[PDB]
Structure 1
C-alpha cells in the first residue's frame, strides 16, 4: 500500500510544479504589458523551477520507488549535476530580486539609471555561469568523490548510486549556494522594513488627526518564512554529516532534501500575486 500511496503524492507534486511554472512563463511571453525589468528575474526563477520539476523530481521518485537505479552509471552523475545546478540557480535569483527591490526604495531617483534592460541580461548570465561552475565542473571532473570503502563500493556498482562527498566540497558548495544569499537577503529586508516603518511614522505624524506595520510584517513574513523554513534544515545537516559519522542517518537526509524541493512549487504564489498577473492568468484560461 505504501508503494501505491506515495506515487500519487509524487505525481501531484510534479504536476503542481509544472502547471505553476509554465503559466507564468507563457503569460509573460504572450503579454507585452508584463515585460518589465523586474519580471525577467521571475522568468529566470520560473525556468529553473520548471527544469527542476521536469528533470530532477520524476527520476528521484522512480529511484526511491524502484529502490534500484536501472539507468547506467553515466546518467547518475548527469542527474546529480542537474539537481545541484537547479538548486543553486533557484536561490541566487531570489537574492537578485531582493537586491533589485532594495535599490528601488533606497535610491528612488537613481533606480532607472542603475537598472537597465542591458544590465539585467548580464546579471542573469553571470548568475547562471556561477551556478554552472559549482555543479557541472567539479562533479564531472570527479573532485567531489569521497575515499572510504562504502563510497568505493557504491561507485563501482552500476545499479547503486548515492551521494557521497568530501568535507571540502560540501562546505564550499553550501557556502556558495545558501549562506551568502541568506545574509544578503537578511540585510536587504531589514533595511526595507526600516524604511517602510519610517514612511508610516511620517504619514501618521502628518495626517494623524484624520482616520485615513501589519502589511509590511505580513509581506516580509510570507517572503522569508517560506524560504528559511524550507531550505535551512537541509543545509545544516549538509554541513553536519561530514563532521560526525553516526549523527545523521540517510533517511533524515533524504527527507530533508525532498522538503526543499517543494519550494519551487510555491514561488508563483509568492511572487506573482499582482493584479496585472491575475488579469493575464484570467485571459489565458477560461
Structure 2
C-alpha cells in the first residue's frame, strides 16, 4: 500500500508538473509572439495578451499550489495562502470570461460599425478596458472572499475553516449562486449572444459579397480573418468550464448527488483550458511563424 501511494504521487506529480509547463510555456510564447511581431499587434491581440496573463497566473500560482493539494492530499501553506490562492483562482476565471466577453463585443462593433470603431478604439483606450476588466474581476473575486461572505454555518464548512490543512472551498449556497452568476453565467450568456450575432452578421457579409468595393472589403476581409480562431477560443472555454459551474449549481440543490472526484475532475478540466489557447492560436500562420521565430528553428 505505502508503495502504491508512492506510484500515484510521483505519477500525478508528473501530469501536474507537465501541465504547468504546457501552460506557462504556451502562454509566454503567446505574450512574446505579440510583444515582438509587428503584424500581430492588432487591437484584439491586446486583449488576447490580457487573456494570456490570466492563464499565465493560473500556471504559475493556481496550479502549482492546486497540484500540491491533489497530490499531497492536504494543504501545506497555511490558512492565509489558502484564501489568497482561492482568490487568485476565482479572479483568473472571471477575468478570462470577462476579456472573452469584451473580445466578443469588440468584434461585433468592428464588424457592424467598422468606422466609429476605427476612430473610437485606440490602443491607449483598450488598456483602460483591460484594466477595467481586471478591476471589476478583482473586486468581485477578492473582496467577498476576503470578507468571508462565502463561509457556511454547516459543521462540514465550520471544521474545514478551523483546520489550516483544509483548503476546500466550501461555500454557503448564496455565495455559490450569486458568485457563479456574476463571475460566470452572465458574462457567458452575454458572450454567447454577442458571438451568435457576430456569426450571423459575418455570414450576411460573405453572402452579400463582391457587392462592396476593394476599400470597403480589404478592411472587412482583415477583421473577419481570425474570427473563427476567436470563436474556437470561446467555444473551448465554454466547454472547459460549463460542466464545473453546471455541477456547482447542481451541488446547491442536492449535495451528495454528483461525486466529489467528478467535481475535482471538472475543476481540473477548467485549469486545463489555460493551456489550450496557444495550441488553438497555431491555426494562425502568423502566430505559427512567430512561435518558430522564438523557439529558434
When the two structures are superposed, what TM-score results if normalisation uses the length of structure 2?
A: 0.86
| 4+ residue runs over 4 A deviation | 215-221
Query: Does the C-alpha gap of structure 1 residues 216 and 69 become closer, same or farther in structure 2, counting only changes over 3 Å?
Result: closer
Q: Distance in 1 between matches of 2:49 and 2:228?
A: 25
Query: Does the C-alpha gap of structure 1 residues 48 and 221 become closer, same or farther in structure 2, counting only changes over 3 Å?
Result: closer
97-106 vs 271-280, which moves further: 271-280
Structure 2 residue 274 is the aligned partner of structure 1 residue 268: no
Query: Does the C-alpha gap of structure 1 residues 280 and 153 become closer, same or farther in structure 2, counting only changes over 3 Å?
Result: same
Query: Does the C-alpha gap of structure 1 residues 216 and 116 become closer, same or farther in structure 2, counting only changes over 3 Å?
Result: closer
Q: Distance in 2 between matches of 1:172 and 1:68?
A: 28
Can you list the C-alpha shifts for 1:75-117, whole angstroms capped at 9, x where unaligned? 1111111111111111111111111111111112322122112
Structure 2 residue 101 is the aligned partner of structure 1 residue 95: yes
RMSD: 2.3
Q: Distance in 1 between matches of 2:190 and 2:52?
A: 21
Structure 1, unmatched stretches of 5+, are 207-214
Can you list the C-alpha shifts for 1:11-52, whole angstroms capped at 9, x where unaligned? 111110011010111222233443332221011111111111
User: Pick from 253, 261, 268: which aligns with 1:251?
Assistant: 261
Can you list the C-alpha shifts for 1:55-85, whole angstroms capped at 9, x where unaligned? 0111111111111212212211111111111
Shift of 1:221: 6.4
90-99 vs 248-257, which moves further: 248-257
Shift of 1:219: 5.6
Shift of 1:224: 4.5
**Contact 2:97/2:188 (8 A) holds in 1:** no
Q: Distance in 2 between matches of 1:202 and 1:63?
A: 55
- SS of structure 2 residue aligned to 1:248: coil
Structure 2 residue 175 is the aligned partner of structure 1 residue 165: no
What corresponds to 1:70 in structure 2? 76
**Contact 1:189/1:220 (8 A) holds in 2:** no
What corresponds to 1:112 in structure 2? 118
Q: Distance in 1 between matches of 2:287 and 2:104?
A: 19
**Contact 1:77/1:140 (8 A) holds in 2:** yes
What corresponds to 1:136 in structure 2? 142
What corresponds to 1:237 in structure 2? 247
Shift of 1:282: 2.4
Structure 2 residue 50 is the aligned partner of structure 1 residue 40: no
**Contact 2:195/2:231 (8 A) holds in 1:** no
**Matched length:** 278
What corresponds to 2:11 in structure 1? 5
What corresponds to 2:131 in structure 1? 125
Structure 2, unmatched stretches of 5+, are 1-6, 213-224
What corresponds to 1:152 in structure 2? 158
